[PDB]
């Protein structure tokens, strides 16, 4: 049913991103597309689940390759194009079209389910660990960062601010939550997980 | 007699012996398709206590089977292994060619005993028991099936499931006592207020050693 | 190849108003279109398919009609959770073309920014680079003016401003102005103030001594 | 004639399963010894409720059940398959059962030339 994605990438390198399809067989009458959105949406390519008919975008003639795998039920995408403008967020999603029990009226309908999300930063900068109280998470690279309060049990009132890139290149944000003044001192702790560097902070 | 549905460019319409026009064109038998749809899409009750209320035994009626080429993915299927209290079976063995329903998510494997005042078990509401591309009117012993109906149309580390074992007492009667068999020595009671995902969370904590058979009862909040 | 443009780029409306988004096409298209919604910090969702049908799990207030070259999406009785970017989509042609996502903004009565100040931490000052945080929460509109007063000195160039999007439930902004400097220029001063100039009585200033 | 969804609920999305009669995979894939098992012969698919089709479909099967049930009680075939081929021939008979001409609605000929 739902889709999850896996994925910094050095220049001229192949950004290997896989789109694993959970809760459903990958081999079917559906299509599978790749979508991205540069900061300030765009269709990348389409691969037919059945018969392996891969179709791409004119602007990406010799710069995109989409492969499928039925064993692991995943879909990989390699980007050898060192365009340096592809530093955006990517997504994968299916579109069942209008398939009346094999009879394919049109194989391009609304994309029903999408992926969880995957951020890519095409840049030449070594990945540096984060640094977390007030809790402010600053001096980290690359983005993004997931901050959870009380292991996710605290969601109301919490409002994390966007990440601003310092002059030193390292990003910096702030995460502050409003709690009753009577509860201050009676516990609380911010839980952070930086998957790019694989460094948990509590 | 039997109505067919010809899909016309947006949706379907019924046209049969009385209704025919030159606009429709059937150039090959591939356009004809018999579709088997599950009863889940109609909003019927899916738990074991209510599903068994729609089945009953009856003698003197010859069973009949019909083919359906394509079917819908079923979430809750049923597999009965009922035997009479003396020890004899109640349902007939699945004949050759008939196999369990292909796509199921929660296969409710009921294993109990009942009076079985009849030869075959039919559907009280008239729905069919869906099997592997075969829609029958009875229940076959130890054979996974799904309730549903059939139509006829004219057209222009992998994915798996999980079975659920049960222990019934007095199957097919107004007085029936169902039991969830989490383990051979640890079983819990059931009711219509239990969802398939809830039972999946039971083993998640039931942990399936001289306590013997233990009957349990849940009182959630 | 086939081009489609969604207009207007910017759009602001109050809760309860009816929004109308248009998406023209360069080439003719059949009754096959789609509309998508993408809330901030969330993956996109399917809102409409085939230009007329609602997706699974969509409230019955996203009305979409049109055919041929000009299509239209209508949101009756806009709500606060509808704050998102809405894009266009093509069908029955290649390549699959999108449109310029129309960013939706919500209108709310002027709110008072709850100003807070957080002096640096003992761990944040041990490395040698202390940082002060001045939080503004639940104010509308986003127009604000936050300045730092470090012992009467107007701090400039060393602050990092960051405004968030309108909250999905509160429909309001939140500003986090952070002043980052070295420990050398930090210990040389005692009081760290932060004044806020907002439309909604007088500039509020929050200070903090050595403590 | 149209169809009205009289069922209590309707699942607009129809996750279906069917067989690919032309899943060739030229080489050695169609051999029963080397082919799939009884479980991997299907190919799934999804059908959105476009223009009330899926809800209008779940009612057609609930209504076909009556006429289909009487048809099964009549025949003695333990397994009935000719139902599809029955309507296939009746369609030809309805249009070519007797004589024909371009004179009325019984026959379908349009010789404009
Ligand atoms: C095609 O689709 C239609 C539409 O769904 C199907 O119609 C259904 O046909 C069956 C056939 O038997 C009927 O069974 C009888 O149902 C009544 C209950 O009906 C009331 O409740 C309905 C459901 O509400 C509950 O259940 C659902 C799902 O489980 C839940 O979601 C709900 O929350 C509830 O818990 C409800 O739909 C009915 O609606 C009424 O109003 C609408 C219009 O608003 C009408 O269309 C309906 O027809 C109806 O008037 C209604 O509120 C049971 O009480 C019956 O039980 C006994 O009596 C039956 C009739 O005699 C008998 O057949 C049973 O065997 C049973 O016998 C009992 O009584 C006997 C004495 O009379 C005793 O001798 C015996 O021992 C026993 O005690 C029965 O189960 C459905 O009601 C009917 N539903 C509808 C909506 O029409 C149709 O079946 C489908 N076709 C096929 C082939 O599947
Ligand atoms: C759908 O049917 C209408 C009926 O007039 C027709 O005009 C239209 O072209 C059809 N759509 C197709 C054939 O794609
Ligand atoms: C049930 O839970 C136990 C945990 O003790 C586990 O060993 C077993 O595999 C589980 N079985 C199922 C069917 O979930």
Residue numbers in the entry:
A (entry chain H): 2 to 8, 11 to 35, 35a, 36 to 42, 45 to 52, 52a, 53 to 83, 83a, ...
B (entry chain B): 32 to 187, 211 to 262, 268 to 280
C (entry chain L): 1 to 200, 202 to 212
D (entry chain A): 502 to 614
The authors write:
In ebolaviruses, the fusion loop is encoded by N-terminal residues of the GP2 subunit and is composed of a hydrophobic internal fusion peptide flanked by an extended fusion loop stem, made up of GP2 strand β19–β20, and a disulfide-bonded base. In the prefusion state of GP, which is the target conformation of neutralizing and protective antibodies, the fusion loop is found wrapped around the outer equatorial surface of the glycoprotein, forming a close interface with the GP1 core. Engagement with the host-cell endosomal receptor Niemann-Pick C1-C (NPC1-C) and possible additional triggers are thought to lead to conformational rearrangement of the GP subunits, release of the fusion loop, insertion of the fusion peptide into the host-cell endosomal membrane, followed by formation of helical repeat hairpins that catalyze virus–host cell membrane fusion. Recently, a potent cross-protective antibody, CA45, was isolated from cynomolgus macaques immunized with trivalent cocktails of recombinant EBOV, SUDV, and Marburg virus (MARV) GPs.
To uncover the structural basis for the breadth of CA45-mediated ebolavirus neutralization, we determined the crystal structure of the fragment of antigen binding (Fab) of antibody CA45 bound to a mucin-domain deleted ectodomain of EBOV GP. The CA45 Fab-EBOV GPΔMuc complex was set up in a panel of sitting drop vapor diffusion crystallization screens, yielding crystals that in one condition diffracted X-rays to 3.72 Å. One CA45 Fab-GP protomer complex was present in each asymmetric unit, yielding three CA45 Fabs per GP trimer. The structure shows that CA45 targets the stem of the GP fusion loop and mediates extensive interactions with both its GP1 and GP2 subunits. The CA45 epitope on GP observed in the crystal structure was predominantly located in and around the fusion loop stem, made up of strand β19–β20 positioned along the equatorial GP1–GP2 interface of GP. In total, 34 residues on GP were present at the interface with CA45, 16 on GP1, and 18 on GP2, corresponding to 32% and 68% of the interface, respectively. The most extensive interactions between the antibody and GP were mediated by the 23 amino acid CA45 HCDR3 loop, which accounted for ~55% of the total contact interface with GP. Apical residues of the HCDR3 loop inserted into the previously defined “DFF” inhibitor-binding pocket, located beneath the β19–β20 fusion loop stem, displacing native GP1 residues D192, F193, and F194, which were disordered in the structure (c and below). D the mode of binding of CA45 HCDR3 apical residues I100 and F100a was highly similar to that of native DFF lid GP1 residues F193 and F194 within the cavity, especially when comparing placement of the aromatic side chains of F194 of GP1 and F100a of CA45. Modeling of the A101V escape mutation at this position predicts a clash would form with CA45 F100a, consistent with disruption of antibody binding and viral escape.
